[PDB]
Protein backbone atom coordinates (compact mmCIF):
# COMPACT_ATOMS: atom_id res chain seq x y z
CA UNK A 1 0.00 0.00 0.00
CA UNK A 2 2.86 2.59 1.03
CA UNK A 3 6.76 2.29 0.23
CA UNK A 4 8.48 5.45 2.16
CA UNK A 5 11.65 6.45 1.74
CA UNK A 6 14.28 8.98 2.93
CA UNK A 7 15.58 11.55 0.53
CA UNK A 8 18.84 8.88 0.17
CA UNK A 9 16.79 6.31 -0.84
CA UNK A 10 16.83 4.27 2.08
CA UNK A 11 12.90 2.07 3.27
CA UNK A 12 10.94 3.51 5.93
CA UNK A 13 9.20 1.19 7.92
CA UNK A 14 5.61 2.34 8.91
CA UNK A 15 5.39 3.98 12.68
CA UNK A 16 1.57 4.19 13.65
CA UNK A 17 0.41 6.42 16.04
CA UNK A 18 -1.80 6.79 18.18
CA UNK A 19 -4.97 9.62 17.00
CA UNK A 20 -5.58 10.71 20.14
CA UNK A 21 -2.05 10.80 21.70
CA UNK A 22 -1.39 14.41 20.39
CA UNK A 23 -4.57 16.01 22.72
CA UNK A 24 -3.60 13.85 25.58
CA UNK A 25 -0.24 15.06 25.64
CA UNK A 26 -1.39 18.80 25.27
CA UNK A 27 -4.11 17.63 28.20
CA UNK A 28 -1.26 16.26 30.59
CA UNK A 29 1.09 19.27 29.96
CA UNK A 30 -1.62 21.63 30.45
CA UNK A 31 0.20 23.29 33.49
CA UNK A 32 3.41 23.85 32.15
CA UNK A 33 1.69 25.38 28.67
CA UNK A 34 -0.18 27.95 30.98
CA UNK A 35 3.11 28.59 32.56
CA UNK A 36 4.38 29.34 28.67
CA UNK A 37 7.01 26.47 29.78
CA UNK A 38 7.65 23.77 27.13
CA UNK A 39 7.44 20.35 28.14
CA UNK A 40 9.06 16.90 26.47
CA UNK A 41 7.44 13.68 26.11
CA UNK A 42 9.15 10.32 24.64
CA UNK A 43 7.31 8.61 22.08
CA UNK A 44 8.02 4.90 22.88
CA UNK A 45 6.88 1.59 21.40
CA UNK A 46 7.60 -1.54 19.90
CA UNK A 47 8.35 -3.31 16.49
CA UNK A 48 5.66 -5.99 15.65
CA UNK A 49 5.47 -7.23 11.66
CA UNK A 50 8.25 -4.57 10.69
CA UNK A 51 6.30 -1.90 11.87
CA UNK A 52 6.51 0.22 14.87
CA UNK A 53 3.71 0.95 17.32
CA UNK A 54 3.76 3.85 19.47
CA UNK A 55 2.68 2.50 22.89
CA UNK A 56 3.46 5.14 25.12
CA UNK A 57 4.04 8.40 25.56
CA UNK A 58 6.51 8.95 28.28
CA UNK A 59 7.09 12.25 30.23
CA UNK A 60 10.60 12.16 31.77
CA UNK A 61 12.01 14.15 34.45
CA UNK A 62 12.77 17.64 32.88
CA UNK A 63 14.26 21.47 32.76
CA UNK A 64 12.08 23.84 30.66
CA UNK A 65 12.14 27.03 29.63
CA UNK A 66 10.02 29.23 27.39
CA UNK A 67 11.30 27.80 24.79
CA UNK A 68 13.51 24.72 25.91
CA UNK A 69 12.86 21.20 26.96
CA UNK A 70 15.27 18.56 27.57
CA UNK A 71 15.32 15.44 29.96
CA UNK A 72 17.52 15.69 33.22
CA UNK A 73 17.93 11.81 33.89
CA UNK A 74 18.27 10.14 31.17
CA UNK A 75 19.06 6.85 33.42
CA UNK A 76 15.66 6.63 35.06
CA UNK A 77 14.05 7.15 31.24
CA UNK A 78 16.47 4.24 29.71
CA UNK A 79 16.06 1.69 32.84
CA UNK A 80 12.24 2.72 32.87
CA UNK A 81 12.34 2.23 28.93
CA UNK A 82 14.39 -1.20 29.26
CA UNK A 83 12.31 -3.06 32.11
CA UNK A 84 9.48 -2.54 29.68
CA UNK A 85 11.21 -3.26 26.36
CA UNK A 86 10.43 0.32 24.91
CA UNK A 87 11.99 1.22 22.11
CA UNK A 88 12.69 5.31 21.73
CA UNK A 89 10.41 5.95 18.62
CA UNK A 90 10.74 10.07 18.61
CA UNK A 91 9.66 12.75 20.52
CA UNK A 92 6.97 15.29 21.07
CA UNK A 93 7.00 19.02 22.40
CA UNK A 94 4.84 22.34 23.30
CA UNK A 95 5.58 25.47 21.94
CA UNK A 96 2.92 27.43 24.62
CA UNK A 97 3.19 30.21 22.13
CA UNK A 98 5.08 30.50 19.31
CA UNK A 99 4.74 28.92 15.82
CA UNK A 100 4.67 25.44 14.83
CA UNK A 101 7.70 24.54 13.24
CA UNK A 102 11.43 23.42 14.28
CA UNK A 103 13.85 25.45 16.08
CA UNK A 104 17.53 25.39 16.22
CA UNK A 105 17.88 23.66 19.46
CA UNK A 106 14.93 21.20 18.11
CA UNK A 107 17.18 20.02 14.98
CA UNK A 108 20.15 19.57 17.21
CA UNK A 109 17.82 17.38 19.07
CA UNK A 110 16.19 15.55 16.67
CA UNK A 111 19.38 14.62 15.51
CA UNK A 112 20.23 11.90 18.04
CA UNK A 113 16.97 10.38 17.47
CA UNK A 114 17.40 10.44 13.92
CA UNK A 115 20.42 8.74 14.05
CA UNK A 116 19.71 5.73 16.08
CA UNK A 117 16.15 5.40 14.25
CA UNK A 118 16.32 6.62 10.89
CA UNK A 119 12.01 6.53 10.95
CA UNK A 120 12.42 8.71 14.17
CA UNK A 121 10.26 11.72 13.64
CA UNK A 122 9.39 14.85 16.38
CA UNK A 123 5.73 16.25 17.06
CA UNK A 124 5.68 19.59 17.40
CA UNK A 125 2.63 21.11 18.95
CA UNK A 126 1.54 24.93 18.95
CA UNK A 127 -1.56 24.69 20.80
CA UNK A 128 -1.78 29.12 20.83
CA UNK A 129 -2.08 28.30 17.49
CA UNK A 130 -4.01 25.19 17.25
CA UNK A 131 -1.74 23.96 15.12
CA UNK A 132 0.46 20.99 14.83
CA UNK A 133 3.28 19.09 12.77
CA UNK A 134 5.42 15.77 12.52
CA UNK A 135 8.71 16.63 11.37
CA UNK A 136 12.26 15.13 10.52
CA UNK A 137 15.56 15.97 8.77
CA UNK A 138 16.68 15.55 5.45
CA UNK A 139 18.76 12.10 5.74
CA UNK A 140 21.16 12.25 4.60
CA UNK A 141 21.63 15.91 4.29
CA UNK A 142 20.01 17.62 7.16
CA UNK A 143 21.93 15.00 9.63
CA UNK A 144 25.09 15.65 7.97
CA UNK A 145 24.71 19.78 8.39
CA UNK A 146 23.62 19.09 11.84
CA UNK A 147 26.36 16.79 13.01
CA UNK A 148 28.80 19.25 10.87
CA UNK A 149 27.44 22.31 13.01
CA UNK A 150 29.77 24.32 15.56
CA UNK A 151 27.98 27.31 15.97
CA UNK A 152 26.94 28.94 19.23
CA UNK A 153 23.84 30.40 20.18
CA UNK A 154 20.59 28.98 20.93
CA UNK A 155 18.87 30.53 18.14
CA UNK A 156 21.31 30.19 15.81
CA UNK A 157 20.41 29.40 11.99
CA UNK A 158 21.21 27.20 9.56
CA UNK A 159 22.74 26.94 5.98
CA UNK A 160 20.16 25.10 3.59
CA UNK A 161 17.43 22.65 3.57
CA UNK A 162 17.62 20.82 7.08
CA UNK A 163 14.22 19.39 7.91
CA UNK A 164 10.43 18.62 6.56
CA UNK A 165 7.79 17.44 7.39
CA UNK A 166 6.47 13.88 7.04
CA UNK A 167 4.53 13.80 3.60
CA UNK A 168 0.82 12.53 3.93
CA UNK A 169 0.32 9.48 3.17
CA UNK A 170 4.06 8.53 4.49
CA UNK A 171 5.73 6.31 6.96
CA UNK A 172 3.48 7.72 9.62
CA UNK A 173 0.04 6.66 10.00
CA UNK A 174 -2.32 7.47 12.14
CA UNK A 175 -4.74 4.52 13.94
CA UNK A 176 -7.46 4.20 16.58
CA UNK A 177 -5.00 2.56 18.95
CA UNK A 178 -4.90 3.04 23.07
CA UNK A 179 -2.42 5.07 24.64
CA UNK A 180 -0.69 5.00 27.99
CA UNK A 181 0.78 7.80 29.29
CA UNK A 182 3.94 7.99 31.59
CA UNK A 183 4.65 10.81 33.69
CA UNK A 184 7.94 10.28 35.44
CA UNK A 185 8.73 13.80 36.97
ZN1 LIG B 1 10.58 23.48 19.62
ZN1 LIG C 1 23.31 24.21 14.58
Same mark, same amino acid.
Given at each position: ????????????????????????????????? &?? %? *?? =?? !???????? /??? #??????????????????????????????? &?? %? *?? =?? !???????? /??? #?????????????????????????????????????????????????????????????????????????????????????
Amino acid at each position: KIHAYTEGGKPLRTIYLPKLLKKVFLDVVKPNT &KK %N *LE =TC !GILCGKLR /QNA #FFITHLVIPLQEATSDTCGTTDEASLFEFQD &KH %N *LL =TL !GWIHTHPT /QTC #FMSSVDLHTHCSYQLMLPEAIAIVMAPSKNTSGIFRLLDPEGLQTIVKCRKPGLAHPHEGKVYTMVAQPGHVREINSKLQVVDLR
